[PDB]
Design a binder for this molecule. Sequence first.
Ligand SMILES: O=S(=O)(NCCCCCNCc1ccc(-c2ccccc2)c(Cl)c1)c1cccc2cnccc12
Length: 330
Amino acid sequence: SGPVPSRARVYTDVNTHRPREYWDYESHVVEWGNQDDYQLVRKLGRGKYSEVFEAINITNNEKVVVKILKPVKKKKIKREIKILENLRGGPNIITLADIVKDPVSRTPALVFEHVNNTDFKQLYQTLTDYDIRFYMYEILKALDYCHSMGIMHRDVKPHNVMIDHEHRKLRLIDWGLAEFYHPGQEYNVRVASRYFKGPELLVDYQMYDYSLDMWSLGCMLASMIFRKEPFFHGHDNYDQLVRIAKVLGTEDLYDYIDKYNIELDPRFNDILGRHSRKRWERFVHSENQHLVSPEALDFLDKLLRYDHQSRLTAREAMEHPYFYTVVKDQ
Ligand SMILES: O=S(=O)(NCCCCCNCc1ccc(-c2ccccc2)c(Cl)c1)c1cccc2cnccc12
């Protein structure tokens, strides 16, 4: 027979207890606002599934951001809208202001709150140890919130974290890949950027949960404290697991596969080989040492586990010694 089932350790049944309409996004009816309320100012960026503009709401002269969606199935747009509405007002979640349609293109556009996000090239050369702890804590507040609300982000990465450094403000954006957690549900593993994919995705284990986000977060943390972006630099999805195995070791990987009775693609049998679990010390050097602490390494170790069940929860992560200074401030 097949893979062993799995349940989230936390927030397992939060959706089952909510009215169906909370999570049953196929039933959601979108209220479209008026495109004529917004005038586009400049293009900010492009993504797989959208073009992003700065715009002005001419009703009230507010700066806003418009995300014009490339063609996607109605149900995927409904999912993102429902999730954004459910999460609206939660800590460090992007605020969806409005939803409009071009009545000639028929293209849908999401309208967001404007966040003054800070030069990408620039700020990186200045991140102190404190800054990294602080912003990691801010991301964890967003993740604990969305997890507690029954939602997996499933695409946590630097591109999806806006920082307004002047205001010490952070927002988690791009909820287009997020999904509701239901115990027993088999999810699509073809999510997330290669470098941030959890082992569960790479081995095709479908019964995953919130803990996916914690792997992605660990990848981010490693890249920041070690000044190595990306940390796990695979050539493709197969090689991505090999890069992980060269760090975490193959013994624990095969233990995970055994525990869940996962059927490993035969492609992997050739290429995984045999690798020791490496000490984190091999990534420390004179340039990055100011970012690296016993605390940082202990925390990182507890995010980056093959076994999704063994990873810290968001709320556990927030209680780690890595954050004691930040917590004492607030
Ligand atoms: O296309 S966009 O204009 N631009 C996407 C945002 C840029 C992402 C920049 N990443 C910053 C970042 C993050 C974390 C980090 C970092 C910090 C601490 C620890 C580890 C890593 C570090 Cl070091 C850097 C856009 C797209 C969609 C919605 C938008 C809504 N309102 C404005 C812009 C929007």
